[PDB]
Amino acid sequence: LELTQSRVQKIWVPVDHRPSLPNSPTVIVMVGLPARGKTYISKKLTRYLNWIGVPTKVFNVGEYRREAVKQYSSYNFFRPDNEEAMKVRKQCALAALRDVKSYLAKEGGQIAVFDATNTTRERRHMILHFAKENDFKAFFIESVCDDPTVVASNIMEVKISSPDYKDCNSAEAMDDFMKRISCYEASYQPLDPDKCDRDLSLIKVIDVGRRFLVNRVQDHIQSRIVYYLMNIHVQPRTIYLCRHGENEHNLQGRIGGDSGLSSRGKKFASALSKFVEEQNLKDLRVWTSQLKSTIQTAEALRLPYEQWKALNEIDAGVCEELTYEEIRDTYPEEYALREQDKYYYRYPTGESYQDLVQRLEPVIMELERQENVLVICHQAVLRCLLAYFLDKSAEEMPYLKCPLHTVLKLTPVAYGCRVESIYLNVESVCTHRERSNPLMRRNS
Amino acid sequence: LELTQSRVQKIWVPVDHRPSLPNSPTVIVMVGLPARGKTYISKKLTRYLNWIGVPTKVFNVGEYRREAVKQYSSYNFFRPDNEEAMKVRKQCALAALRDVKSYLAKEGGQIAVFDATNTTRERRHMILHFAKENDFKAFFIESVCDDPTVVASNIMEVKISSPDYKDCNSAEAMDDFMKRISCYEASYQPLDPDKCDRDLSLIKVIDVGRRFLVNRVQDHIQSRIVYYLMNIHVQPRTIYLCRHGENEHNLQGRIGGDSGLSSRGKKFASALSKFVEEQNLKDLRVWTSQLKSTIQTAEALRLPYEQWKALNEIDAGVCEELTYEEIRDTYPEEYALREQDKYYYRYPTGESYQDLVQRLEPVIMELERQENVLVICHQAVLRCLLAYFLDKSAEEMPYLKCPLHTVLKLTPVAYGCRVESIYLNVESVCTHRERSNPLMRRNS
Ligand SMILES: Nc1ncnc2c1ncn2[C@@H]1O[C@H](COP(=O)(O)OP(=O)(O)O)[C@@H](O)[C@H]1O
Ligand SMILES: Nc1ncnc2c1ncn2[C@@H]1O[C@H](COP(=O)(O)OP(=O)(O)O)[C@@H](O)[C@H]1O
Ligand SMILES: *SC[C@H](NC(=O)CC[C@H](N)C(=O)O)C(=O)NCC(=O)O
Ligand SMILES: *SC[C@H](NC(=O)CC[C@H](N)C(=O)O)C(=O)NCC(=O)O
Ligand SMILES: O=P(O)(O)OC[C@H]1O[C@](O)(CO)[C@@H](O)[C@@H]1O
Numbered sequence A, B: 001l002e003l004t005q006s007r008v009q010k011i012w013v014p015v016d017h018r019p020s021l022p023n024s025p026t027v028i029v030m031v032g033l034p035a036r037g038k039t040y041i042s043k044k045l046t047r048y049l050n051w052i053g054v055p056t057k058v059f060n061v062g063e064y065r066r067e068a069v070k071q072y073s074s075y076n077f078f079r080p081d082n083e084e085a086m087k088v089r090k091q092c093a094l095a096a097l098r099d100v101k102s103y104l105a106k107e108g109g110q111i112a113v114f115d116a117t118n119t120t121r122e123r124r125h126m127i128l129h130f131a132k133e134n135d136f137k138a139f140f141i142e143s144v145c146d147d148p149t150v151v152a153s154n155i156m157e158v159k160i161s162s163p164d165y166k167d168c169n170s171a172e173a174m175d176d177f178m179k180r181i182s183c184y185e186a187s188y189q190p191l192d193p194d195k196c197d198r199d200l201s202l203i204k205v206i207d208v209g210r211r212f213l214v215n216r217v218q219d220h221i222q223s224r225i226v227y228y229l230m231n232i233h234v235q236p237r238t239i240y241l242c243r244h245g246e247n248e249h250n251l252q253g254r255i256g257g258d259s260g261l262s263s264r265g266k267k268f269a270s271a272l273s274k275f276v277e278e279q280n281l282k283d284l285r286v287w288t289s290q291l292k293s294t295i296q297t298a299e300a301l302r303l304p305y306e307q308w309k310a311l312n313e314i315d316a317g318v319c320e321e322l323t324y325e326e327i328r329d330t331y332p333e334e335y336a337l338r339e340q341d342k343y344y345y346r347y348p349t350g351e352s353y354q355d356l357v358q359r360l361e362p363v364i365m366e367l368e369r370q371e372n373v374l375v376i377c378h379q380a381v382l383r384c385l386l387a388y389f390l391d392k393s394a395e396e397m398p399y400l401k402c403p404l405h406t407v408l409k410l411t412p413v414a415y416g417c418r419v420e421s422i423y424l425n426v427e428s429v430c431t432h433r434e435r436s437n438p439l440m441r442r443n444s
């Protein structure tokens, strides 16, 4: 009824004249033998939830273990008859759960990913008890895969080169790790939604996503997690990101708008076409925004492309078509507010980087399902997408560097994405702007 | 490179100077005993896919059967020893599949929902053969539920009042239908993803959504279907929709903008508050847009609410803040184009109803997961949402009637939504505008 508009995020809020006074968090429990992609799922899911704004953190019991033990000697550390190490392993689990408690009850976290094997009913029972007693929801993710080819390949890809094997050649690293896995085999009790685990909320991922069993999804975040797990795959592939060729507003320093390519932006577009041909890709999808400059760039390729409105550049609202010099002059306060809080700032009647993230989510979801893809887009859009793939925070996203006429080439390696930059050697202007009391204290 | 902007949808396209020259469709196969919600899933999924723009149609073999037989006498028609009727039933299935073929190969349909029991391997095999031979993808949805309470309740809710029982009282309708179900029991072969159905793409829905088994999702549309099935529920509930109280742009005939409530819009807001209290709901969620007028309306309720940017009113781009009389005067061609194709039309630098649908999809998905919800929104937004619940086409959506100060109350009944209108007796202006050669032929 009486409301004021917040100056940064442009949100209407009730005017509070007295500010002097005055949906449980969730633990995701990983389950499975070693080298089943538990840690891979932990990190990727966490990169997703963070980028869409649900604060999430991975608690990797193995890293608590390395912290406490220092150098790994061999699989003998994991024998079920190793009384002292079984004890230390338990201690690492319980220290991880203490931090889980602190994260969720004290540091404003919403999702805690408890990444360990959790292969016995007894250990899962204790985790349930800890969640109940603290009022957290529990959701279980079990990865099941007995294909020896996938296990072998997982070991080569992430295990022989982990810190546990700093000292090792490949063949013996592999040999140690195989025996380490067989340590857990005799006591492993897979999740059983028919009998014993009927009242648990869970997903079983089977044969790398070929099949899934889902029991009792409870809420908003749980059903998204399941949809996300069902749409990612481990096939190797490549993602290319770039901006439209230089346009005429770029030549004028003007933001937003819908102008066409300059003669350089056009020369870039032919360079992009030769570059793509030289990559020699089997099938390649091409995506653009609905703005003219990205579409003119894609036409030079002579490949089919799809236009997405969700890839249009951030909307500057009343500042569209203006230069930054015009904005500082006409809207000095809006100018200063954007520089102090560039992620959360919304242009009047336009958008923030925060809004851009929400709108790009379906683009990200579909990119997960594709193989080879080239995305021709815009400066602020490209920073968002890059923040997702490279795991950058919200505070750094609006400052990521993404110059004109340069392709960022992303390849899946280990637990994330390697980025490689290829500048296509066509000049263009620079659109990157770096991050930028006296009277308001006494002795005025 | 050389492109033109389409006048209605504002899409850049290559200029074609010679227009004189020049991802398989999918059959969804329903599977299950009678009264397992197959038809319910068929219709609801189809209402969803159509509203998000994937042309879909239900082929209900039972309706082919009623067409061909005329009056139903009893469950004896469904006996496996009824040689002549087994023949006619088969004929209805094959006539349905012919129409499926015509819909998908000839009428531009993309998804065909084949709604029948399909309870034997032999019948499913023939459907596979028909899909293969025509190059369609096949995806199976099996509903499994042996809770006698749910079956009984499903029969009371949709079967005793179906056309098959026009002639009948409740007890005997129920009795006939129970025996009809037991006709199919002996030969029923549930989908078996372990052995026989390992290479099929399928979802098994178990105990009304308590549990799911998912085998080999293949593509974009299949993974959305699964996510949609996992998020709807049959618990009874109520959805309320209305607009912000009247605002000052409403008093001026002006479109878009961010103005506050008039004194009437405020009187409506207290009326809404008393109305909500009189409904006596257990928990009620309240959603608004981020525009001031909806938020001022929600404050009068003194209940917690959530603001969604996706509920903001359609964006009129360069025409924001203008009256319709100013738009006709300054942009006569844009005015005329919008009147001739109101769904697909996009305001320059703004949106169409088509864009509004894409942006509201997450709102619809989340409404599916809720129980009691009140959505305070805007004229064009409210028509979109109402088109989804009431199954209206794209061509009618922009003309649906949704006056100020009136709540639309939606309740789940049978296979859809009943709508009830409650006007809260506060005057307001009217914002509804109805749908509106000579020189371009010779004898000029
Ligand atoms: N669902 C899955 N099943 C089996 N392997 C997977 C799965 N998802 C990812 N991977 C592979 O798992 C490997 C990483 O294993 P890691 O996450 O370190 O396993 P863990 O934590 O279970 O010991 C990567 O090679 C990745 O490709
Ligand atoms: N997954 C499900 N399992 C069981 N019943 C359901 C399911 N989904 C909806 N229903 C109920 O099914 C009833 C409608 O049955 P109907 O679709 O006519 O069944 P069928 O087509 O299998 O004969 C409705 O009462 C609805 O609430
Ligand atoms: S199902 C709960 C568990 N009980 C059993 O394992 C009995 C055998 C299985 N239930 C079965 O065959 O059905 C349980 O709590 N086990 C404790 C453990 O640590 O193994
Ligand atoms: S699995 C393919 C089917 N063969 C069988 O049913 C053999 C028995 C089961 N496979 C089993 O117990 O594993 C099949 O095609 N059956 C044809 C039918 O119409 O029943
Ligand atoms: O967030 P920033 O750095 O202002 O960059 C986004 C701007 O960059 C541009 O893409 C090019 O200058 C403008 O169209 C857009 O407003």
Ligand SMILES: O=P(O)(O)OC[C@H]1O[C@](O)(CO)[C@@H](O)[C@@H]1O
Binding pocket: B254, B255, B256, B257, B313, B314, B316, B378, B379, B380, B398, B431, B433
């Ligand atoms: O699609 P239509 O009928 O022009 O209605 C949408 C318009 O209605 C209003 O909500 C109220 O007039 C405007 O804010 C908006 O532009």
